[PDB]
Structures are given as structure tokens and as C-alpha cells.
Design a protein around this ligand. Structure first.
Ligand code: HEM
Ligand code: HEM
Lengths: 247, 248
């Protein structure tokens, strides 16, 4: 760690000040120097013989990668503000799924947490659902009280407490069978490969393609890296820094 | 194909009738016989000139596996009824997750679809969430209007249209810091390995452990394999067969 300490103190002092402020609410730190790194995080020293420990978002399994993980953490402070990059991540994130989770309000007054197959044509997204499923009644009766969530697989996520997610308050509407329907479905068949029952449900008339018109969105890709979305506008949510601990 | 047809006609005639009834709502079929199998499904012939095609829930890439895939589908008709086996699968399914999806009702009136880390002390399950998140207001103000979903990862599922899932109408209640909190949190650290920020959020006072009391549940593990659950009782939902296409 001796070499790492030298490296950080020589090229990432301003980043460390950024980390101290963002994660520790330490605003006027002096004598900022890198103290250590271990498989789970780093320790930054400052001021009156003090330190702030900041954990990585995963365990770094090989000591050979401690340096890069530390650099990534230091660079995350400014990267948080690369809105163009976040916008591109959001687009690519959505393209990596063939299904989404939903919250709907059923006519029985109870919320419903479910999931449905996701399809798309251009920038238009849709879900394909059956009248037999509990979420159908809510999509039909409360079409504008719906939230759609793109949630990263637990097995692909950094940890159980940081699964990347993209959520949108959504207005829904039914799409009748026809040209629009076939374009979305053919696209789904091509992308997925079309096996597994997909061909069967296309012919089941109790299934409906429902367009998703997204309104307010919230994207979370890392600790202290949450964003609000609306149309083509995206804004970082934490200019004030760590809000936890009743900050 | 000749050997597979011969095998199915000699050993699975009753299963094929079961599949015709279940998936095709064909009840008085005669002259039932196995017709073919391909990478995506099987075809059963019946009557003078009719057939029913039933797709596998995944593509069988190697023809060496067609017979087993076919036998699996045939045997699924009766296996669907094994409630003791389903009970076992449900318990094991929940133990395979360290997080769940949630639907909550925000005080403003809109529903919220989110997710939270999942913890437990034996049979008691809990979630751990922060006051900074939108689902907190619904968990605090509409604590008995919540649905928890255990959803299989898309990358592990048979397909996009068949991700296994277990959903429960749930009543929630807050757990104060103390011995119960520590038991659940310590168990979570030991299970997950405790890296990635878990240790940091334990100390954040804006986070609360919330116990989940599951009520009605619905488990879906395959096509035509959906079950209703309430406490210690489980029941198969499809006695009437394929409900799709407005079969009523
Ligand atoms: C022929 C092949 C079948 C296919 C491809 C198929 C497909 C599907 C799909 C994709 C859904 C999800 C709908 C949604 O979430 O909106 C579904 C739900 C359902 N299916 Fe089927 N199904 C088939 C046969 C059956 C049969 C034979 C039964 C009954 C014995 C059945 C009973 C159900 C029930 C009860 C649900 C609702 C499950 C839930 O709680 O989400 N299905 N089916
Ligand atoms: C010290 C490291 C941090 C850790 C371990 C951490 C952890 C978490 C966790 C686990 C959640 C999800 C809570 C829930 O869904 O109930 C969360 C949410 C959130 N955090 Fe942090 N956080 C950290 C720092 C920060 C900082 C520095 C900011 C602000 C600049 C921040 C802003 C937020 C916001 C806005 C949310 C809500 C996200 C959402 O919509 O789901 N966090 N944080």
C-alpha cells in the first residue's frame, strides 16, 4: 500500500477532498492524505489526526486491483456530473432488458407488485400482459397510476444493497392488434430468439400490448449517484451531499 | 423420431391426454398419439386429423435431449399437483434472495414500484430501507397495503415471459434498534459476506428494519403452474385448465 499511498497523495488529493465532503460531510479538511486500502474500502486521513473510511461498492477480491478500485472511487466524484454519460447509461440500461417490474393499483384497493415482458419499437416501450394476471385489472381500471421499474439482476449487481434501477411514473394505454402490434412483437421475437412460449402467447387473445408513456423518472447507479429524469432533462439529486443520518 | 414416437405412445398416452386437456382444452380426444418433437416443442395428434402443439419453456439445443424434454413435459401434468414439493420450492426460492421488489402506496395516492435489501431471522423476513427513499412514505403511512415480490433474475430464468416469481400481500411494522435488529443484521452480514456498503448503512439512522408478515401469496414456476398460498395452505390454481383465450 506504500506505493498506492504515494500515488494517491500525488495525483488524487483534490478527489480525496471531494470524497471527504460528499461522503463524510467534511467541508474544510486540511492535511488530506491517503492512509490505506483493503478489500472493502479506503481510509483517508485529514485534520486533527482524523480519518474517514469509505467502503467500495463491492469486495475487491484481488489485492492487485486495490489501486484501480481506489482510483475509480476517487474519480466517481466528478463522473457523477457527466450527465451526457448518465443519459447514455440510461438508454443502454433499458436496452438490456426484455422485462420490467410493475406497481399497479388493483380495483380491490390493494397495490400489486408484478413483472411483465417488455417490448419496443423505436423509442416506444410496451408491456405484454394477460387478463388472467392480477396486474391486468389495475392496468385497465387505473391506467395512469402505474410505476415501471427496470431493475438490475441481483446476480449481476455490485451487491444486494446496490442493484441499479430506473423507475418511471407511467401512463399506460392499450394497443389494438395490427401493424404497431406486429412491429413490436416481431422485434421482440428477433431480439429474444422467440423460443420458450413467446410464439404461443402472441396468439392468446387474452393478452394485450400496452404502451408505456414515461413521466417522472429516478435512476440510481451508485451510492450518491441518483438522478431525476423528465423528458430529455436529467439532473443529479445530491448537490447537498450525503443526506443520510439526517444530514 | 421413430423411437421417440414409439416411446411416447407406449409410455405416456395418459400424459398426452392430460396435456391435451390442460394446454389445449381438448377433453374427448380419441386416437391420441405423439407426432413430433423439435427444438421448440412437441406436437400431439388426435382424432382423425387434428394436432395440438405445446412449446417447451426453453429451446432444447441438442437433439440428444429431445426425449427427456418431452418426458419432462409429459410428467409435468402430474408433478404440478405435488403441493409438498411446491411448499419446499417456495421456501428454497425465498432463501435464494438477499433483496425483493416492492409495491407501496404513497400518501399522495400513487403507487410506487421499488426494491429493498431482504433480511431474516429464521422464518421471519424483514426489509431495510431509508427515509430518503420514496417507498418509505408508503411503508410508514400505508403499512398494511404492500406487496412483496421475489422475482427470479432475468439472466437465470427460462425466458423473459417465464421468470419465476412469488408475490405476497404483506403487512409491515417497524423494528426498533436492539437485539432483534442485531440478530437479523448480523445474519445478513454473515450470509452476504457483508461487503459493499452494508456495514456503512447499518450505522445510518435514517434506515429502518421493517418486518414483513406475509398474507396471501401467489407463486408461478411454470406455464400452468401457478399456486395460491395463505399461511400453511397452498392450492394449485389451474384445475380448470388453460384459462387463456377466454376459455371460460
Ligand atoms: C399454453 C402455454 C401457456 C403459455 C405460453 C402461458 C403463458 C403465460 C404468461 C406469459 C403469463 C403471464 C401473464 C402476465 O403476467 O400478464 C401467464 C399467466 C398465467 N397462466 Fe399461463 N400460459 C400457458 C398455459 C397456461 C395453463 C394451461 C394454465 C392453467 C392451468 C395457465 C394459467 C395461468 C395463470 C393462472 C396465470 C396468471 C399467473 C400469475 O399470477 O401471474 N397458463 N401464462
Ligand atoms: C456513504 C455512502 C452511502 C451509502 C452506503 C448509501 C446507501 C444507500 C442505499 C442502500 C439506498 C437505498 C435506500 C432505499 O431504497 O430505501 C440509498 C438511497 C439514496 N441515497 Fe445513498 N448512500 C450513500 C451516500 C449517499 C450520498 C453521498 C448521497 C447524496 C449525494 C446519497 C443519496 C441517496 C438518495 C437520493 C437515495 C434515494 C435513491 C432512490 O431513489 O432509491 N446517498 N443510499
Amino acid at each position: 500500500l506504500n506505493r498506492i499511498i504515494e500515488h494517491m497523495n500525488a495525483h488524487h488529493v483534490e478527489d480525496m477532498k471531494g470524497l471527504l465532503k460528499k461522503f463524510g460531510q467534511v467541508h474544510h479538511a486540511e492535511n488530506v492524505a491517503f492512509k490505506s486500502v483493503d478489500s472493502q474500502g479506503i481510509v483517508i486521513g485529514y485534520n486533527n489526526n482524523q480519518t474517514l473510511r469509505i467502503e467500495f461498492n463491492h469486495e475487491v477480491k484481488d489485492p492487485k486491483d486495490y489501486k484501480n478500485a481506489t482510483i475509480e472511487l476517487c474519480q466517481s466524484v466528478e463522473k457523477t456530473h457527466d450527465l451526457k454519460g448518465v443519459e447514455e447509461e440510461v438508454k443502454a440500461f433499458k436496452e438490456g432488458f426484455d422485462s420490467v417490474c410493475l406497481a399497479t393499483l388493483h380495483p380491490n384497493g390493494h397495490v400489486v407488485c408484478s413483472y411483465a415482458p417488455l417490448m419496443s419499437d423505436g423509442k416506444q416501450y410496451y408491456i405484454y400482459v394477460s387478463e388472467v394476471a392480477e396486474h391486468f385489472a389495475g392496468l385497465k381500471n387505473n391506467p395512469h397510476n402505474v410505476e415501471v421499474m427496470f431493475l438490475e439482476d441481483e446476480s449481476k449487481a455490485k451487491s444486494a444493497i446496490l442493484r441499479k434501477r430506473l423507475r418511471y411514473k407511467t401512463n399506460t394505454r392499450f394497443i389494438e392488434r395490427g401493424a404497431e402490434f406486429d412491429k413490436a412483437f416481431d422485434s421482440f421475437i428477433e431480439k429474444t430468439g422467440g423460443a420458450g412460449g413467446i410464439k404461443t402467447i402472441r396468439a392468446m387473445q387474452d393478452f394485450h400490448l400496452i404502451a408505456l408513456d414515461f413521466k417522472e423518472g429516478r435512476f440510481v447507479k451508485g451510492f450518491g449517484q441518483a438522478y431525476d429524469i423528465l423528458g430529455d432533462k436529467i439532473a443529479y439529486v445530491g448537490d447537498k451531499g450525503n443526506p443520510h443520518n439526517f444530514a
